[PDB]
Amino acid sequence: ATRFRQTRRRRGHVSMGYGRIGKHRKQRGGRGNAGGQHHRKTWFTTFHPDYFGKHGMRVFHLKANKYYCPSINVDSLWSLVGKDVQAQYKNAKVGEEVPVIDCVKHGYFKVLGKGFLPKQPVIVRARYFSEKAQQKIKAVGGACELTA
Amino acid sequence: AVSNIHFCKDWRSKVHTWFKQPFRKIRRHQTRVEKAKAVFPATIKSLKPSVHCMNQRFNYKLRLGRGFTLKELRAAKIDKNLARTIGIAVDPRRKESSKECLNRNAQRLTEYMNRLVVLPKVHAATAKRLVLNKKNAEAKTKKAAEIKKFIAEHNKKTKQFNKLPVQQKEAKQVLDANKVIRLTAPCTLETKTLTKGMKAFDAVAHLRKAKNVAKAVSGIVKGQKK
Amino acid sequence: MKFNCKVSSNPSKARKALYTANASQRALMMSARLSKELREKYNVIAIPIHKDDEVKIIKGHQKVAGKVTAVRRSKYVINIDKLTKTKANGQTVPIAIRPSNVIITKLFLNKDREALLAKKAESRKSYKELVAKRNEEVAKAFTAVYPALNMDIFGKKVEPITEKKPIRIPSKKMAEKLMSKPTLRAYKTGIKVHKAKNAIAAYKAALAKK
RNA sequence: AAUAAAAUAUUACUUUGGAUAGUUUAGUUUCCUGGGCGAUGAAGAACGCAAUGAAUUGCGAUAAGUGAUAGGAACAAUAAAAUGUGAAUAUCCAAAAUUUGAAUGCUUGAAAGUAUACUAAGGUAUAUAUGAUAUUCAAUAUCCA
RNA sequence: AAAGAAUUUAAAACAUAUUAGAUUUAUCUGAUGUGUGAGAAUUUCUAGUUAAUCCUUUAAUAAUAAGGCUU
RNA sequence: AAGGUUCCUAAACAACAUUACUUGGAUUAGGGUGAAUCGAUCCUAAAUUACAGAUGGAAAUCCUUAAGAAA
RNA sequence: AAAAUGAAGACAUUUUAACGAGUAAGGAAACGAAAUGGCGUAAGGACAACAAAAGUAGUAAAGAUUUAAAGUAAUUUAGAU
RNA sequence: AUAAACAUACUUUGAAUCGGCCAAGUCUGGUAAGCAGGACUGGCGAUGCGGGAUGAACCGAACGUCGAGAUAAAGUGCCAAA
RNA sequence: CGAGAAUAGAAACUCUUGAAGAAGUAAAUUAUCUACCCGUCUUGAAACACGGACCAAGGAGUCUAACAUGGAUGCGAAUGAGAAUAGCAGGAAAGCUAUAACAUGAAGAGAAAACGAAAAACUAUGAGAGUGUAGAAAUACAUUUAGCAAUAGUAUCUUUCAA
RNA sequence: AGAUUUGAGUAUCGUAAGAGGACUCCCUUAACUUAAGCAUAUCAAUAAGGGAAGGAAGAAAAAAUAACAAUGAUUUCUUAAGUAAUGGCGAAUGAAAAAGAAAAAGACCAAGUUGAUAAGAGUGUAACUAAUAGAAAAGCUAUAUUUAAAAGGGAUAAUUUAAAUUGAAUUCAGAACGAAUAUUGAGCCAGAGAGAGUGAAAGCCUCGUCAAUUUAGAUAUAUCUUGAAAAGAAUAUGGUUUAGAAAAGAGUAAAUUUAUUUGGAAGUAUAAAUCGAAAAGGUGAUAGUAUUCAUCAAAGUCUAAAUAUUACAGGAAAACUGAUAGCAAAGAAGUACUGUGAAGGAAAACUUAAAAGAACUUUGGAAAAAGAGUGAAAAGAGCUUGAAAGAGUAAUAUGUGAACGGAUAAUUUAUAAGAAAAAUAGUGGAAUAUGUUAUAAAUAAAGAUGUGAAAAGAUUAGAUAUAUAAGUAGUAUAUUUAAUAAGAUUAUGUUGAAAUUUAUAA
């Protein structure tokens, strides 16, 4: 909407809101991130204090697929099957039939332990487990299964 | 935020606009229709395997591959020379990855071969194959008796190749065979019985024992040479 | 609406093809309509004009009837012996007339107009029998749904549905609050004007009664 | 102190100028189909051709046009002649297509020319590199009587 | 010392033996055969012993080399 | 050499030759250039350019009778 | 700014009180008690005689010259030629 | 004690700007400068109005459009109101 | 003599001018007061600082791409999927439909290996809801209850040599 | 002499050249610019220079990825991704596998084998030849399996391309105009209300547009026929007697160095100098040696489809420009004109419906002027309208070294405000007010909770017909017989808000 810009409101003003003592000239200190260590050092120190330097080891060819590991906490496990199934198997214990949560089928590899689980037995099938994740699943009456 | 914009080169000669996009649909769709009218079996997008994706990030998913291996055709009792003529993709470059891949893609070929209806090479009713079917039809009936029996009672040498299903039927023209034979059955909610042993299985220790075993092979080799 | 993608609906392209058209397509464009006497004899609506024809001007200052003395296709005009203007010094010049302001009253039919007119006649008949085939098919499908009616109802007067069933919808209260001020003010003024007209109509009727 | 000749100001009319308004046989962009030249001489250049033409258009010693096939009565600034026994007009067709130009017998500056062979004048062929076949040769290059 | 069922049918790599051919050279070429590799224990824990022990070189290790982290 | 019809004649003077022009190298329309012997054409000078050969990534460059079964 | 009223009136409500200079600069649009208010140029989609012939126009459009009126102003409206 | 609810505390985003100049019951260098440089405050810049004849800074006083009065700096022989 | 209070009383008019042009407004001239050349750089220009002879038309913060803040909008542990692409009616550069790869987010710290969050929280002040009394018009006190947002401070937990 | 090798001349039949280069494949070591200087770097496979191509070109069938529950020629799009990495680690530069789509197609030489070997080659044609990757020849054979006389002709149909033809409804009526399409009134067509022309605005005047027809041209599109439907042939795993007891791309891969290049960093790609393999070997991007593992098998060739296009030609569109705008060019525009040359490079749209473009007289040497006439109107060719700057004419007004502006009045001019009407006392009450009745209208429901039906389907168990059959409730389709689970959609009860406010007639 060019009719809502500031240019339409500054017609008749000589400098178009840019100053008379200091004009609107071509440059204001260099093109791009110029002068990162001479006259814009106070900008990089103030707002990007670790911009210049090196840190860590180079990975010549990083295989980004080997670091892929989606995570889900324990409190969010039941949302995979919904509250309808959760209430159905609310009154189960050892011996009878218990729902299985397939984290891998939903795209989750590692199960972390955060928050609180409902007080029902459940079987959790996944690729990795945290120490506190297995504790919270076992403390509620469930079992942990590995995959892949 | 520090800006990283790569417009210092002459981007104006690098700009590609998509004004032809609404007309690619019309071109491709019309050509796709034209091929179907020419020889409708051709556009069927010949059957393809069910192969897993690569890497652990995707390895639980199935996707159509290119071509059945020569071992999968043998398992399904199809000649590799006749396979290409009846809309089957064949990829000799594919090494058989596993027994499960061999079995799963053997069902795909067998299921496709049951839905297949090959028309006679010559439309005349005097074609040799149609005549040949009549000549040995009496042998088929007695053959179909004993096969129907030891199947009905039971429930190492087999035919090398099966027969091509050849007959005369109405032309029900289906634009592709991959969408008729699904890769994966719909997934229901799996559910299991909780046992005492299941409650006792410690998953974390198994993960760390498996990991720490792999990281102690160096300690084994280093101490060996000493 | 045009659906043939080959023809153009650009006004500028149409005029360009009008000025640069060759003689072959200029003849078929300077057509004129036959008169009642000639239409009944030949069953032909219009034919391209020709020299030595007799026409009658129907639009213009002078509606005279004369003989065609010149068919100028470069100027897209025709000339009549009766329509002339004296050129000051004494000589007369013909007055150009567009061929769409005249109707032919006497053909000059040697041998090719005869063949053309016969061809033009059968084309009219062939289209008439084709329209009749379509019309009965449309009528046949109308009877199968309304067997008690006939297709002539579409040519007569239509009686509007006078029933005024209202519907309760929980948005009529919000109608005034869903208009912008420019369209709210116009709506309210129309209501105010309509009410005042009804008030004067009511007062007039009372006076007429009394 | 006085004058309104000049000067100044307003309006009407006229003038120099071509703004403004109305308009478009012209452009710009995108998209669809093709992307069809040449030793069988191309693209380009030059000269010439209309009853009255200088440009432009079309054409090539058959010249603003020829034949054939469609086409059906015109063109016009002024005359002429032709014209339903076929005027205009149209073309992936037929004949024809000047000097040049890759330019290719030799030469070429703004150069007029000119050699041989085949069929006086006219018309064809003869540049360089190259494949196949035919024919004539060269070198003891290898044998060899 | 204490808890532990482990998931279920279409198979090739060849470590090879044993034969049917050919070969002399760092000699090869088929087929018959079994296991391998097969599936209807494993973990924790206390006391020893041995070994390894700051991270990485992305198929697994090793001694060299190189790169990381702190100063 | 350069110019290119400016040459000759007739009609005519809107424009042009710092006034004017009946004049004009200006407007319009016609006419006008005759070679065996004068020149070009022929020969070579300073120099210039080809086929093949040599050089070059390339465009192209060198060579002018040396390198050629050429001339 | 604060009170009162508030489906449509209208003048962007009613009342009271304080306030109003200004270069550079800022206050985009919408927001009923409106988080500034408006004028103008051109083009696109709608609306424009509510009873079935629905904005103006050869009974004179656009434009041009002026005379007057409205608005603090940008500008608008109308008459005459 | 006095004042303070359109008080107070802000948060975010951002414009312009960092050539200055003047006065003085002030200071330093200099013989001195309408010179050069500083401490505190008020101004001019950005500012018109009344007075000083005239003046960026002096004195009174800061500005929506007007009417009527009392005033400020300062004036009351004529220009010029008294 | 007399406040309060109770009881009774009283205000509707003249003149002049105006379609023979009132009031107002506009134009020209005169008279008193008043008025330096516009734009720009500059501490400071009417400047003996620069551009400007006059008029008309053209004339200068726009477009693409990445990020951030902010106001309106839809959905919300999800949002987008006008990613390519594939279909539908209609003939359509428009419209509609696609259980979908992925993008951002739901988990953070470490160079990396290796890991991966509760004492079902605590304290302080704080939004709101009542009941009574009184002034008495609104409103002003007493008292019961709840303690969201925000700020600050605590335990506890993940990662790091280091929070 | 003769048999060969090599090299020439000539003759015949052909072949290359030049134009174009928008898109395509390449050669070459630009600089301006950024880095607030600058020298590496950036600009940048960028400009200029040069070569070669087609309707597309390039690439293309792993000495390829990956470390997986693994993929599998090439090309193009999405994502990865401003990421790994590169970089005076500064400015800045910068991919690819995985994954989602469009399209899909695989075949050859060389080497090896067969040798009464085959106009031209024997210094070798021809035939066979790979993932069960020791092949290759001759004859027998077993089992599964494929199989109509091929190619080429002729005809109909279908799908497309082009041309031609056809293609409705007021030649309506009145008034008025120079002129009707406009205006008033009465009708009609529409699978046609896209558009143009017509004295002026048209759905019905012309041409076209919607629905169509015909005729030609092709398709590797089907049918029938030539054409018999046989003999045989073909695919794969075996057995058998002979024949045989192989090959798999060399100045190549790699190495030392130099130079360029790359995101590729102890060297990603190319080239040059030197060196140079093989009882093979290459790759797994941190150099090195060893042992395992994985995965391919280089150093010859071809290959459609999906993709690009601002040359050029033909079309269609547009929230583009409307004559200082839009291409430089709306007219004889790459034209006039300038330069020795390479090159540079404009301006200029409009009379009217129709020229009906005044035509005869007087004055004048003539050009012209005045009459006259045409036209709806001179709009009179320097022609639609005709602004400002600059002048001329007429009217009005003013005056001593500038002019113009503002406040306030005076003079003059102009504009411009009206037709009703008093007091008191007989009638005469008229709009309206108050409240009484009646009528009409408008205004209250957001939800909550019961009982059903139901299409396309899904699953399971039978039956029938067809095809196929692995020894794994056999599979697949079509039609039916039942049964269970849910069902988009959809029907209908109960429950729960009224009594006010306006208008109208008395």
mmCIF file with all atom_site columns, C-alpha atoms (C1' of nucleotides) in Angstrom, chain F residues 13-14 57-60 69, chain J residues 7-8 27-29 49-50:
data_model
loop_
_atom_site.group_PDB
_atom_site.id
_atom_site.type_symbol
_atom_site.label_atom_id
_atom_site.label_alt_id
_atom_site.label_comp_id
_atom_site.label_asym_id
_atom_site.label_entity_id
_atom_site.label_seq_id
_atom_site.pdbx_PDB_ins_code
_atom_site.Cartn_x
_atom_site.Cartn_y
_atom_site.Cartn_z
_atom_site.occupancy
_atom_site.B_iso_or_equiv
_atom_site.pdbx_formal_charge
_atom_site.auth_seq_id
_atom_site.auth_comp_id
_atom_site.auth_asym_id
_atom_site.auth_atom_id
_atom_site.pdbx_PDB_model_num
ATOM 1  C "C1'" . C F 1 13 ? 11.048 35.317  -58.284 1.00 0.00 ? 13 C F "C1'" 1
ATOM 2  C "C1'" . A F 1 14 ? 7.378  32.167  -52.562 1.00 0.00 ? 14 A F "C1'" 1
ATOM 3  C "C1'" . G F 1 57 ? 44.752 -22.377 -26.820 1.00 0.00 ? 57 G F "C1'" 1
ATOM 4  C "C1'" . A F 1 58 ? 42.255 -19.173 -30.103 1.00 0.00 ? 58 A F "C1'" 1
ATOM 5  C "C1'" . A F 1 59 ? 41.288 -15.412 -33.485 1.00 0.00 ? 59 A F "C1'" 1
ATOM 6  C "C1'" . A F 1 60 ? 44.969 -15.285 -36.520 1.00 0.00 ? 60 A F "C1'" 1
ATOM 7  C "C1'" . A F 1 69 ? 55.660 -34.038 -57.133 1.00 0.00 ? 69 A F "C1'" 1
ATOM 8  C "C1'" . G J 2 7  ? 52.448 -41.262 -52.437 1.00 0.00 ? 7  G J "C1'" 1
ATOM 9  C "C1'" . A J 2 8  ? 50.489 -38.307 -56.258 1.00 0.00 ? 8  A J "C1'" 1
ATOM 10 C "C1'" . C J 2 27 ? 38.422 -21.838 -24.381 1.00 0.00 ? 27 C J "C1'" 1
ATOM 11 C "C1'" . U J 2 28 ? 40.523 -17.451 -21.784 1.00 0.00 ? 28 U J "C1'" 1
ATOM 12 C "C1'" . U J 2 29 ? 44.074 -16.304 -15.479 1.00 0.00 ? 29 U J "C1'" 1
ATOM 13 C "C1'" . G J 2 49 ? 37.585 -11.595 -27.501 1.00 0.00 ? 49 G J "C1'" 1
ATOM 14 C "C1'" . G J 2 50 ? 37.078 -16.991 -29.838 1.00 0.00 ? 50 G J "C1'" 1
#
